Structures are given as C-alpha cells and as structure tokens.
Ligand binder design. Structure first.
Ligand code: BR
Lengths: 264, 264
C-alpha cells in the first residue's frame, strides 16, 4: 500500500533508534515530545480497526513498530518509578500523585471498568502487575472501596509500591511479591491484569488453572491504531475463556478493557 | 472458548446441510425464517469483533460457514431475480421495487455511502456487478441525480436489468455488458464495487490499471459477525490501494462500505 502514516512511523522509529544507541537510560522529560507525536497517531479517531491493522501489521513496519512499542514500555516504567519516588518524598502526596502523566486517564479507565465489572464496595480484587506506582490498586480502594491485593514480581519494585501506599495513607491495599501463581492462595471476586503484565500466554494459563467460572476477569489490551503502543492480547492468549464485554477507549485513554469468564 | 453462538451456528448449519450443492433450488418465501435466524446472529451488537473472528476463523466452523454463505448468496440472487421480473410485470413498478426485501437497507447503505464518497448531482458513477435488479444504479440516479453506467458480465442478466430500468422510467442509468475491463473506455468520478462482484482479486487488479489517484472507489464487504454472511474482501485483494474511510453498519444493514484510492 501507500499510507502517509508509514513514513511518519519510520521517522519516529529512526529517532528512537538513534536515542537508544546513545543512552540506555530514559530521559523522561526530554522524550515527552516523542510520546505526544506517537499518541497523536494512536489517537487519530478517523481510522477504523481494519484500516489500523492494514497500516500497523504490514511486514515493512515490523521493525519500526517494535522500537515504538519498546519506547512506550520503557518510558512508562521510568515515569512510574520516578513518580513513586516523588510521592514517597512529598509532603503533599496526593497532589504529587495527581500530577502523574497518566493519572487522568486511569481515572477514566477505572470508571469504565467498574461499570463493566459491576464493582461493589467490599469486594475482593487482585491486580496483577502493580509496578512501582500501583495506581489502579490505590484507586480500587480509595474510590471503589474494594479489598485489594496487588501482585508484583520484582521484590524491590514491590517494596517501593508498599512505600507509595503508606505515603498516601491508603488502607485496604496489600502488595504481594511474586508471580501470578500467588493467586491460587488468594480469595477474590474480581481479577485484573495490567496492560503490560507479561508474558500473556503464561499469565492466562495460570489464571485459567486457578479461577472458577463465576469469577470476573478484566484485562487491559490495545486495539485499532492504539496497537502502535503495545502488542495486543491475542485470541490464542485467551484460550479457555469467553469474552463477555468490552470497553473501547476514547479521548486520550490508550487501553481497551475486556471482561472474560473461564469456560465452560 | 464456549460462546453460545457457536452451537447456534452449528445448529442452523445442520438444517442447511441437506440443501448442499442445490441451494439455487430454494423456495424463497419458505426459507425467510432461516435468514431471520442467521440475521439474529449477524446483527447481535453485543458480540465484539474479536469474538466474531474467534468464531469464523476456527477450523471447526469451516463447513457450517460455507453452508451459511451458500445459503445467503443463493437466497439473495433468487430474490433479486424474482423481484426484477415482478417489477417488469407490474402496474406499479416503483411500489413493487420498494417491496424488495432489502430495499430499506440499500436505501440507508447508499445514504451512508453518499456522505462517505461525497456524492453530488451530475457526477459520473460506474457500478460494477449490477445483477438482475440494479437497485444501487437506479437510486444513484433517481435520488442522487448521478449519471450512471452499470456493468454486468452476463448478457442475459444485463438484458433483464435494462428491462427493470426501462419499466421504472428512470433516467440516466445505462447497462454495459462486459467485464470490469470496460471501464477502460469510460470516464467517471466514482467507482462502486458490488458486494457480490467476483473474483475480488481479478476485479481489483483490473480496476487498478484503469483508474487514477483521485478516483473515489467504494466497495462493499462484511465485518464482525456479519462476515458470517459472505467472505470479506481480504488484504490481498486491495493491494495497491489505500483505505481512506469506512462506514460500519447498524440496524439490519449487512454491508460495510469502504472508500479507497489508488496509490499514491
Ligand atoms: Br474488540
């Protein structure tokens, strides 16, 4: 084909490639223009899902896509780490937390999800893939009055997260250090899977073994042009589950939210 | 997975099996409940595009899918033939035309397409694959005041369509007997491709040779659960074209309309 977005993406990737050659370590302030250029493409409403995969999954875009998707994850992780450290240091922690680049977005995303998953105060939720800034976990308790365990595989990241939660004075959020297998030993009404929790195939196979058919499972994925940001969850990833609802994003939200139940 | 639609589709297909390879022999009036059954499924808005794809792409669904598709194409063709003769014989041809089962649907589909393609009075349209009842051709003129050539490969079908057009007294619609290659000798502003024009690969490869980069080309295809009805136009078919816009259907409309331009 001949899409103008193909050259734009290749030029972005080239810039990312040159940057990474020079520095392993992300300069979070400096690369905010690159993120906004990438998000303008991802957010372009005038483009349907089929057209999105025609442009994105074209073989000649694979290298550029990989670089962009690596950027997004690395930037996200560094933004979370920096903000976590900021919150811990702050004498005004909630003010510092609301300044996080994605804060307004998670706010909208959760509201969407709570409707999709019928969240009720008092229910037990497990969130897989907390990261250093366990924003979803925190909101689930602070806003939705849920009883939350956040699971984090990396012990130092998990420790930082506990410090964030304590700095915010948020009750009812516990952090578990380990992989998604810790869910066998937990009771929960709802289970959420972070957008960047990996590997997807393994994570869904572990969910499948350790849940029953009545437990609500909500995962975060990417669709349409927003798949420039990250690889979506594949239908093969969700073998043995049935999709029972979706919330497609709008505005600046990047994630699609999917409700599934284990078969059968 | 365990979608309820899976079993429902297999059940409907079981009742089509005994018509296999002789669907053209269908009783049109007596099979309408069967179309309603398939349509209840195609038009279900709660089924997301990923779920629809899980179903239609599964190897186990392949024979039931061919049975449903053979049923839908044969029913549509028979109805078209039956209505064309009915119009020709009618004292009230316009009213008879409007009693066509898909009439209300085509009217909305065209409405959508006219916005998408920016149709205007006096513009030159060519419609590939007229069939016996060239409704789109007739409406492009009768409603949109466009000047139309309808292309029909089968000489006896072309002859019948001309009778339908002459019976209605509609201006500015001519039928050319031939393949899509006849566009070589034509001048036009908008090219439309019928949902049923086949084989898509040969057709689009010929269209590519004869149009330019500013020709508006609209084709009809199937997306989501509506792809149960007929094989969608593939990525491979529209090589050398770029998508510029899409109208997704709602209500009982079956076709997705897609606007393309030749590269660049
Ligand atoms: Br979807």
């Amino acid at each position: 084909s001949c899409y103008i977005y193909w050259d734009k993406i290749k030029r972005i990737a080239s810039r990312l490639e040159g940057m990474n050659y020079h520095f392993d370590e992300m300069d979070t302030s400096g690369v905010m223009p690159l993120l906004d250029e990438i998000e303008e493409i991802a957010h372009d409403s005038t483009i349907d899902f089929e057209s999105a995969k025609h442009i994105l999954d074209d073989a000649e875009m694979n290298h550029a896509l990989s670089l962009i998707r690596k950027f997004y994850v690395n930037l996200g992780m560094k933004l979370q780490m920096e903000k976590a450290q900021e919150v811990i240091e702050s004498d005004s922690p909630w003010e510092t937390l609301r300044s996080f680049y994605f804060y307004p977005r998670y706010l909208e995303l959760l509201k969407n999800e709570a409707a999709l998953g019928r969240f009720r105060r008092g229910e037990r939720a497990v969130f897989i893939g907390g990261g250093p800034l366990p924003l979803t976990g925190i909101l689930l308790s602070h806003v939705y009055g849920m009883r939350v365990n956040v699971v984090e595989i990396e012990p130092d990241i998990a420790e930082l997260s506990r410090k964030v939660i304590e700095g915010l004075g948020v009750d009812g959020v516990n952090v578990i250090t380990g992989d998604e297998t810790v869910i066998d030993g937990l009771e929960f009404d709802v289970l959420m899977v972070a957008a960047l929790a990996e590997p997807k195939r393994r994570v869904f196979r572990n969910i499948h073994r350790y849940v029953d058919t009545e437990t609500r499972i909500i995962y975060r994925t990417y669709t349409g042009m927003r798949a420039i940001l990250y690889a979506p969850v594949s239908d093969d990833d969700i073998t043995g589950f049935r999709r029972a609802g979706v919330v497609l994003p709008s505005g600046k939200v990047n994630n699609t939210s999917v409700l599934v139940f284990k078969c059968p």
